[PDB]
Amino acid sequence: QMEKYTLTYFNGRGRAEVIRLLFALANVSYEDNRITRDEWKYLKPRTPFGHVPMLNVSGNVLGESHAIELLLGGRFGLLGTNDWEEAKIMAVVLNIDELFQKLIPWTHEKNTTKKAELFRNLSESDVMPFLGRYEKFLKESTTGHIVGNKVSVADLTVFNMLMTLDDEVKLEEYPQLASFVNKIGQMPGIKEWIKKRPKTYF
């Protein structure tokens, strides 16, 4: 008997989307529970840390996006082939989290002038360093993976962030990242999920 997975998050990509990509890529079925703010009022105090995403695995509850990505990544064979690769994959995931956190105001700014200003102010300090970093990791990789020789949670995380930034970065100047984003995006499971998934502002 398969574990029953239920992911709870708002109706949005946000901090849940890498988890949704892991399920998509692994072709592992789960319930994609998207709640409203109002439903969240009641649910928040019964969660372990007062946040979403949350994962329910056959009656047992786990919080924290990167802990959930750890668990699923491990079960789905997306944490490399040894404990060193696993740790390097998780380091990347945690590094992208810092960038995600810096981008929160931008993601939620619906005024286009103000949103462009938020982004401008992060361009040199965070976005350009991100692109350079991951361009270089890939340049130094022989297989076009962020860590090791197969797809991992880190690939999905960097992929997801590139999609987040798609309208604001030019990947012609980062040919490794351009190739990578097309490769991950064409993977079965991922490709159908991107077409399928609810279109949300963030």
Residue 44 binds what, of ligand GSH, a second copy, none (CB under 5 to 8 Å, by partner type)? ligand GSH
If one asks whether residue 75 binds a second copy (CB under 8 A), the answer comes out as: yes
CA 127 to the chain's CA centroid: 16
In contact, 174 and 113? CB cutoff 8 Å: no
Q: What is the dihedral of CA 122, 18, 5, 12, to 10 degrees?
A: 50
Q: Closer to a second copy by CB, 59 or 198: give it.
A: 59
Region 87-116 residues binding a second copy, contact defined as CB under 8 A:
87-88, 90-91, 94-95, 98
* 20 near ligand GSH (CB under 6 A): no
Residue the block writes with tokens 């462009």: 116
- 15 is an active site residue: yes
Considering the candidates 9, 30, 134, 174, report the single residue annotated as catalytic: 9
- The CA distance from 127 to 103, in Å, is 9
| 4: DSSP letter | P
5 is known to lie in a ligand binding site: no
Q: Is 106 a catalytic residue?
A: yes
Does residue 8 contact residue 33 with C-beta atoms inside 8 Å? yes
Q: Which pairing describes strands 5-10 and 31-35: parallel, antiparallel, or unpaired?
A: parallel
For residues 96 and 91, what is the distance between their CA atoms, to the nearest angstrom?
Answer: 9
CB atoms < 10 A from the CB of 26, how many? 16
Q: How far is the CB of 53 from ligand GSH (least distance, A)?
A: 6
- Binding-site string for a second copy from residue 111 to residue 150, where x marks contact by CB under 8 A and - marks none: ------------------x---x-----------------
Contact with ligand GSH (CB under 6 A): which of 18, 19, 25, 52? Answer: 52
Find out whether 125 is annotated in a ligand binding site: no
Give the interface with a second copy as residue ranges (CB under 8 A): 48-50, 57, 60, 62-64, 66-68, 70-71, 74-75, 83-84, 86-88, 90-91, 94-95, 98, 129, 133
Catalytic residues: 9, 15, 106
